Design a protein around this nucleic acid. Structure first.
Ligand SMILES: [Mg+2]
Ligand SMILES: [Mg+2]
Ligand SMILES: [Mg+2]
Ligand SMILES: [Mg+2]
Ligand SMILES: [Mg+2]
Ligand SMILES: [Mg+2]
Ligand SMILES: [Mg+2]
Ligand SMILES: [Mg+2]
Ligand SMILES: [Mg+2]
Ligand SMILES: [Mg+2]
Ligand SMILES: [Mg+2]
Ligand SMILES: [Mg+2]
Ligand SMILES: [Mg+2]
Ligand SMILES: [Mg+2]
Ligand SMILES: [Mg+2]
Ligand SMILES: [Mg+2]
Ligand SMILES: [Mg+2]
Ligand SMILES: [Mg+2]
Ligand SMILES: [Mg+2]
Ligand SMILES: [Mg+2]
Ligand SMILES: [Mg+2]
Ligand SMILES: [Mg+2]
Ligand SMILES: [Mg+2]
Ligand SMILES: [Mg+2]
Ligand SMILES: [Mg+2]
Ligand SMILES: [Mg+2]
Ligand SMILES: [Mg+2]
Ligand SMILES: [Mg+2]
Ligand SMILES: [Mg+2]
Ligand SMILES: [Mg+2]
Ligand SMILES: [Mg+2]
Ligand SMILES: [Mg+2]
Ligand SMILES: [Mg+2]
Ligand SMILES: [Mg+2]
Ligand SMILES: [Mg+2]
Ligand SMILES: [Mg+2]
Ligand SMILES: [Mg+2]
Ligand SMILES: [Mg+2]
Ligand SMILES: [Mg+2]
Ligand SMILES: [Mg+2]
Ligand SMILES: [Mg+2]
Ligand SMILES: [Mg+2]
Ligand SMILES: [Mg+2]
Ligand SMILES: [Mg+2]
Ligand SMILES: [Mg+2]
Ligand SMILES: [Mg+2]
Ligand SMILES: [Mg+2]
Ligand SMILES: [Mg+2]
Ligand SMILES: [Mg+2]
Ligand SMILES: [Mg+2]
Ligand SMILES: [Mg+2]
Ligand SMILES: [Mg+2]
Ligand SMILES: [Mg+2]
Ligand SMILES: [Mg+2]
Ligand SMILES: [Mg+2]
Ligand SMILES: [Mg+2]
Ligand SMILES: [Mg+2]
Ligand SMILES: [Mg+2]
Ligand SMILES: [Mg+2]
Ligand SMILES: [Mg+2]
Ligand SMILES: [Mg+2]
Ligand SMILES: [Mg+2]
Ligand SMILES: [Mg+2]
Ligand SMILES: [Mg+2]
Ligand SMILES: [Mg+2]
Ligand SMILES: [Mg+2]
Ligand SMILES: [Mg+2]
Ligand SMILES: [Mg+2]
Ligand SMILES: [Mg+2]
Ligand SMILES: [Mg+2]
Ligand SMILES: [Mg+2]
Ligand SMILES: [Mg+2]
Ligand SMILES: [Mg+2]
Ligand SMILES: [Mg+2]
Ligand SMILES: [Mg+2]
Ligand SMILES: [Mg+2]
Ligand SMILES: [Mg+2]
Ligand SMILES: [Mg+2]
Ligand SMILES: [Mg+2]
Ligand SMILES: [Mg+2]
Lengths: 122, 200, 180, 131
RNA sequence: AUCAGCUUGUUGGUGGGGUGAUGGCCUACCAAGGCGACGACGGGUAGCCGGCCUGAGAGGGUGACCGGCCACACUGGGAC
RNA sequence: GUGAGGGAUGACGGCCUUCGGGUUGUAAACCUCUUUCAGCACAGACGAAGCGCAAGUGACGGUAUGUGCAGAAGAAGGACCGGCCAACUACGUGCCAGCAGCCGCGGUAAUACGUAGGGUCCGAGCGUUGUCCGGAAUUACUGGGCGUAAAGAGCUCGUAGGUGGUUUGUCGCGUUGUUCGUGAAAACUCACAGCUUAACUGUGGGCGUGCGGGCGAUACGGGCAGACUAGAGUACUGCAG
RNA sequence: AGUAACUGACGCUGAGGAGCGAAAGCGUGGGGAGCGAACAGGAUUAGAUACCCUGGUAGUCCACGCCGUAAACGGUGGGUA
RNA sequence: UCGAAGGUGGGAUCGGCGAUUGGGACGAAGUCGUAACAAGGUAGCCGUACCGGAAGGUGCGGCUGGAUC
């Protein structure tokens, strides 16, 4: 591109493909879960993961993955949701934090304890 | 906050002695753990971090502290490596150790924190005190009467006193004159790795 | 005393009617630390043979670095292979700032202060080729003045004259200390 | 069309250097003439002299080669061109080849070399980098 | 420009009123144009600046605190 | 700030073993030390050449700060350990239960899952999450390409704009030529100095990268005030399609 | 291409704009030998709404208008040294 | 005279929902098929018109990023 072209037009910078737009750039939201069920991964991975449908304060319906091996979430439950991507599940972009509101840390955790919300043994 | 754990761990894992009198290091040079003999792939980042951790766990400094020395040394116009070496050696703990008044960096630091030292007649209890050119270091009578200080000051037969440091008498007065050069400092390790690692 | 380094190890493969035949290739850089650079690319089926071939090729192929005391003379824009590697000197003690392959080749060269950047095709082989070409592109003030037919003071800056004189004095002092 | 005599001159000179030629004939102009003058003064070229042609004056430039045949010119490039014209103040004089090259700057005195221009404190537009 | 024409006190002159001060600031009378592809009029966003972060630089992002102005005081107006 | 000096070819107990043994380990129990800071007491500020013709005036605070007393006595956790990326083995289920930033890891013997040890990083903070720059030369003025990866519009005429073939002449509007003249404070950078050093701030510089007018220049980069022709066109003769 | 008589900075590229443009397609009115989408049969295949065979309606031709797209390729814009 | 609020009536923009329909992508595995990649068994592709569940076929014009002779 030549000098007169740059002067006449100007160069437009790239636009960023925003991720987790349901957060509106806000790291955490509170939500209430509507349904809890299971989903299947893609071809490379065969498993049976657990996901939940949560109503956000932003009035946006989004899936939410449940980490850990045990949970007590049922319909109409208070949930705190952060942002986190999973590969195997196609349309899941969020992970449910553990240890807040109605969810309690999964038992028998001693290694990597702070991530999953386990109190200290005495 | 200071590392309260064993000091021989650093030398054993890392592969070069720090205190210098470690019999365990010369008994077993390989790193501890069930698998310290496993072959490890060469890495420029391994060796760059290795020099860093040697330096920081040898002089006993804090991570934020040492990064602040790095940026300070960078912003003086002088050569970055020499500036970093001066700004680290100017710690009163290292000064009083290399002057022969302390058996190790940890003990110098502990005694300075407890405050057995006088700087130009002014009470000082800060292990990370800064010593500039042409300063005077004094030791109080309450500490001359202290037994371990007497042991150190009449057992001071350690590494020779450097050019910029020198004692004048039994009172253990430490004086500083000028900026040493790297050649006569002859400190182990190599500041190039540390400066390049923080240049990352 | 030579400096030896390995930058990359690759498991290359060949195919026949039976199946897969594996092979190993390695690239190494040799240097004396004074300004003598050698690069070697060696291939085998096992790492020891590969590194032996690389060392032999590097010993065969050498190149000399005309450095001023401790650093490079002038900035060089080394455009070769498929990567763009830009080298220039710096203030003493700043360090040899470069990527992986450039780091290895410059440390084998023995330079202590350089500013570098790789602008594309981060592949180690192409980067090494570009750095070698950059060092080839380097020009030295004395024979630059000889080519231009103009004396040193009328070509080279007084600051670099002062630096060269200081470097010569330091080299003379080091030689005297070594002799004594 | 023929739209930049100085760039054309620089490219013909460096093309001749690449092709190992010895003599180049170009249409004569004051800018070409005094640029050849400063080239002669710095010593990158061998010698120049003007001539007369079928129509107007023409200038011939003889390239410089040594015993070992390596090029006396490494490379040329123009920074100030019609359109993008770059200028330098009295303090921001460009550094070329780490001070081992030459930038041609037109000052109140004329087309003069960067080192003595900084000595005088004067400055202007940079014609080309020759190294 | 996936916004091409906009405007009628609008534009300009004269005479009056007006305001601390000149002025379509307001009125009357005369003429038809001014602004417009070196982006007008439209649509969305947003207080501006010394500064902060990043980057060698260019540049990019941004307006925490402090400080220089700007505008508002439940919403819309008006005046002493 | 949660300590130490010395202390064994290295005491329990755990984990592996090739059943020889190796590990946690100078770590620990031990003999001595100073005991910072909290704890208990005493003294106890400056902040005020300030205001009053009164007799005094400090919320902070009876704090900061010094002087004594007792006792190692009251004080450490968080992530990682397949490659990128400094840090590995065993035990428990096997396309299940699960990990995960990219590649990607379990289909009975996983350094990638869970538990144990062991080591690594960091530390009164440790990670996750979201926004912004860098690497991204990945919007390329410095600093990218258009044959096949993304791109030459189907090709011309041509308006507005952008750019010009030599040398013959002023004014100096593109411009550098030096000086006085602004650049609030604050911030950045250099040196000095004070709070025991620490944040904090105490003084004087310096910095304050732009823009104003008066005085001094004319080589390039434009209009303007006159001539020639190497691009271009015409003119004379032929030419092939 | 040659002589170079003459003009004496008229040159270049060109956003928006305008004109030309392969074949096919459309309107009107004519023409229409051969060729040939569509559509019938005959043939193969388990299957052919194709490849093959026999026929043949638009179109292919003419005049006036239109659409303005092609692997519109040298997959390379033009001009100058 | 001006004057905010309120009400009359029709044009623009942002939208939210809306039976049903059109299209797209991800699943995994099944039927119908042989399309393309070797002269892929009819050389490929491009523009265009018609036809057929489907990939496609044909007509006209253009390129070789087509192999033999
Ligand atoms: Mg081009
Ligand atoms: Mg995109
Ligand atoms: Mg983990
Ligand atoms: Mg794990
Ligand atoms: Mg960095
Ligand atoms: Mg290039
Ligand atoms: Mg690249
Ligand atoms: Mg890369
Ligand atoms: Mg009036
Ligand atoms: Mg008047
Ligand atoms: Mg008015
Ligand atoms: Mg009037
Ligand atoms: Mg600014
Ligand atoms: Mg930068
Ligand atoms: Mg940048
Ligand atoms: Mg701003
Ligand atoms: Mg303020
Ligand atoms: Mg003002
Ligand atoms: Mg209001
Ligand atoms: Mg209001
Ligand atoms: Mg002890
Ligand atoms: Mg106290
Ligand atoms: Mg007082
Ligand atoms: Mg007083
Ligand atoms: Mg105190
Ligand atoms: Mg690891
Ligand atoms: Mg590692
Ligand atoms: Mg297992
Ligand atoms: Mg551990
Ligand atoms: Mg970034
Ligand atoms: Mg350029
Ligand atoms: Mg680019
Ligand atoms: Mg392409
Ligand atoms: Mg094209
Ligand atoms: Mg097109
Ligand atoms: Mg014009
Ligand atoms: Mg002037
Ligand atoms: Mg002036
Ligand atoms: Mg000024
Ligand atoms: Mg000031
Ligand atoms: Mg800075
Ligand atoms: Mg002081
Ligand atoms: Mg200052
Ligand atoms: Mg700046
Ligand atoms: Mg002009
Ligand atoms: Mg004449
Ligand atoms: Mg002519
Ligand atoms: Mg003809
Ligand atoms: Mg004539
Ligand atoms: Mg033309
Ligand atoms: Mg044009
Ligand atoms: Mg034009
Ligand atoms: Mg246009
Ligand atoms: Mg156009
Ligand atoms: Mg037309
Ligand atoms: Mg037409
Ligand atoms: Mg036809
Ligand atoms: Mg036709
Ligand atoms: Mg039709
Ligand atoms: Mg028709
Ligand atoms: Mg008809
Ligand atoms: Mg037929
Ligand atoms: Mg047919
Ligand atoms: Mg019939
Ligand atoms: Mg049929
Ligand atoms: Mg097209
Ligand atoms: Mg064609
Ligand atoms: Mg074209
Ligand atoms: Mg061209
Ligand atoms: Mg809508
Ligand atoms: Mg709806
Ligand atoms: Mg099938
Ligand atoms: Mg086929
Ligand atoms: Mg077939
Ligand atoms: Mg085919
Ligand atoms: Mg085909
Ligand atoms: Mg088609
Ligand atoms: Mg057909
Ligand atoms: Mg055709
Ligand atoms: Mg091909």
């Amino acid at each position: 591109p030549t000098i007169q072209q740059l002067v006449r037009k100007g160069r437009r910078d790239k636009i960023a493909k925003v991720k987790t737009a349901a957060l509106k750039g806000s790291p955490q939201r509170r939500g209430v879960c509507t349904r809890v069920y299971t989903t299947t991964p893609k071809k490379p991975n065969s498993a049976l993961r657990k996901v939940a449908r949560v109503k956000l304060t932003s009035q946006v319906e989004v899936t939410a993955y449940i980490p850990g091996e045990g949970h007590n979430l049922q319909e109409h439950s208070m949930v705190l949701v952060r942002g986190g991507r999973v590969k195997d599940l196609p349309g899941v972009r969020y992970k449910i934090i553990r240890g807040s509101l109605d969810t309690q840390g999964v038992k028998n955790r001693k290694q990597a304890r702070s991530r999953y919300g386990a109190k200290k043994e005495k | 906050a200071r590392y309260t754990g064993p000091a021989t761990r650093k030398s054993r894992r890392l592969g070069v002695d720090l205190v210098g009198g470690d019999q365990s290091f010369e008994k077993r040079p390989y790193p501890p753990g069930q698998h310290g003999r496993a072959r490890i792939k060469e890495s420029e980042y391994r060796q760059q971090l290795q020099e860093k951790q040697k330096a920081r766990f040898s002089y006993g400094v804090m991570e934020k502290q040492f990064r602040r020395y790095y940026e300070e040394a960078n912003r003086q116009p002088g050569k970055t490596g020499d500036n970093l070496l001066r700004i680290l050696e100017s710690r009163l703990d290292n000064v009083v150790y290399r002057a022969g008044l302390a058996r190790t960096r940890r003990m110098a630091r502990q005694l300075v924190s407890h405050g057995h030292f006088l700087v130009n007649g002014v009470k000082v209890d800060i292990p990370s005190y800064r010593v500039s050119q042409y300063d005077i270091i004094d030791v109080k009578e309450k500490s001359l009467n202290t037994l371990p200080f007497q042991i150190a000051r009449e057992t001071a037969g350690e590494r020779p006193i450097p050019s910029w440091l020198q004692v004048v008498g039994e009172r253990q007065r430490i004086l500083v004159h000028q900026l040493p050069e790297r050649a006569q400092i002859d400190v182990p390790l190599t500041e190039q790795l540390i400066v390049e690692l923080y240049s990352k | 005393n030579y400096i030896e380094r390995v930058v990359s190890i690759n498991r290359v493969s060949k195919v026949v009617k039976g199946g897969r035949r594996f092979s190993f290739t390695a690239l190494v850089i040799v240097g004396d630390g004074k300004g003598m650079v050698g690069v070697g690319y060696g291939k085998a089926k096992e790492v020891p043979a590969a590194i032996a071939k690389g060392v032999e090729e590097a010993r065969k192929n050498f190149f000399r670095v005309p450095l001023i005391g401790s650093t490079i003379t002038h900035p060089v824009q080394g455009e070769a292979a498929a990567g763009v590697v830009m080298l220039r000197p710096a203030s003493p003690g700043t360090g040899v700032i470069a990527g992986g392959a450039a780091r290895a080749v410059l440390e084998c060269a023995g330079v202590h202060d350089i500013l570098a950047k790789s602008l594309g095709s981060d592949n180690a082989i192409n980067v090494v080729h570009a750095t070698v070409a950059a060092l080839k592109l380097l020009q030295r003030p004395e024979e630059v003045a000889a080519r231009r037919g103009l004396p040193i003071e009328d070509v080279a800056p007084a600051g670099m004259l002062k630096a060269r004189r200081e470097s010569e004095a330091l080299a003379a002092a080091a030689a005297r200390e070594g002799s004594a | 069309t023929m739209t930049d005599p100085i760039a054309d001159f620089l490219t013909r000179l460096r093309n001749a250097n690449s092709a190992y030629h010895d003599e180049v004939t170009l249409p004569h102009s004051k800018l070409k003439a005094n640029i050849a003058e400063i080239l002669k003064r710095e010593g990158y070229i061998s010698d120049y002299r003007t001539e007369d042609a079928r129509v107007g004056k023409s200038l011939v430039v003889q390239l410089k080669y040594g015993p070992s045949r390596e090029r006396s010119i490494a490379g040329l490039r123009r920074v100030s061109k019609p359109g993008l014209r770059v200028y330098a103040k009295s303090t921001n004089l460009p550094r070329v080849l780490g001070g081992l090259g030459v930038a041609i700057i037109s000052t109140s005195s004329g087309l003069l070399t960067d080192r003595q221009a900084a000595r005088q404190g004067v400055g202007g537009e940079v014609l080309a980098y020759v190294w």
